[PDB]
Write a protein that binds this ligand. Sequence first.
Ligand SMILES: C[C@@H](O)[C@H](N)C(=O)O
Ligand SMILES: C[C@@H](O)[C@H](N)C(=O)O
Lengths: 11, 156, 158
Amino acid sequence: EATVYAGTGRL
Amino acid sequence: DPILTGVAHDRSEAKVTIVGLPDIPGYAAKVFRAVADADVNIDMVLQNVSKVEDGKTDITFTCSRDVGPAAVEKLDSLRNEIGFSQLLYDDHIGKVSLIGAGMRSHPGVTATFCEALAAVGVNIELISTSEIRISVLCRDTELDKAVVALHEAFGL
Amino acid sequence: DPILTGVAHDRSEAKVTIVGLPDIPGYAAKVFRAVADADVNIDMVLQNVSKVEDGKTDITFTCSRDVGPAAVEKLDSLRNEIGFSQLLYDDHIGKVSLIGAGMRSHPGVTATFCEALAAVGVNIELISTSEIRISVLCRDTELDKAVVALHEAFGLGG
Ligand SMILES: C[C@@H](O)[C@H](N)C(=O)O
Ligand SMILES: C[C@@H](O)[C@H](N)C(=O)O
């Protein structure tokens, strides 16, 4: 499972 | 009653979450040795309990935004060894803290802290406390209003 | 270098976990106001992040074993006000902490702490750290061996 870059409120 | 000296805020950190770490011995060791090997200074570590349904839990730590990517890269390189399912990285967090002493005998303080943030619509992403500090992470764009709310709620 | 002053341990506490709380403003407030209303003092408080899959997280706190059931019943009585899905209670925990200073610039300290417990087969249930303390909970029957391992790893308790 790919790393989630969170916090941006974006795709 | 408790003493409250101030409110602290920090916009320089990121949070790294290791999702689905096996809840058996030695796994936090693998995570933190990796982070230390990467030369990544750690501010806060938080791990809550597994639930029996999956026998796994998450570990989150915060570090400076400048070194978060190095931590992610290092953990990612050890996916087989460590056995986690996913990494989450969030470099858009603010850390806000109520500073003081003698808070354990006053559960109303933690409640008031959370009520103050709720009333201004700040979502508490994570909570960690000690004898001398109640710390939460929130969106960095919510940090200022969280600070103002705590100032007002505690006369600081 | 980090300054490490002691290893403390406590077998007087229980852990209460509020499971499945919506990760939305106002929910932690309801939990802690209920606990405050019951006049239950709380020691450790920990909440990690939700993930998108359910939008929920858990809140754990510790308190004295004597008042643990009062905290549980108060929360249970408000389970539909608050909206969590379940309460977990564990009155068989040991708490062990490494106490010191200057630990932020020394991630090897946190690694060492965990490696010491791993070496003696102690499972780490929960972790909460700061630049002046590393605290974990383990099964109370594992506390003693955890303490000894930490004494040896950090050259404390002579
Ligand atoms: C889960 C709980 O912390 C919630 N996010 C709140 O802000 O109340
Ligand atoms: C999840 C992690 O803390 C594991 N229980 C360990 O002891 O390493």
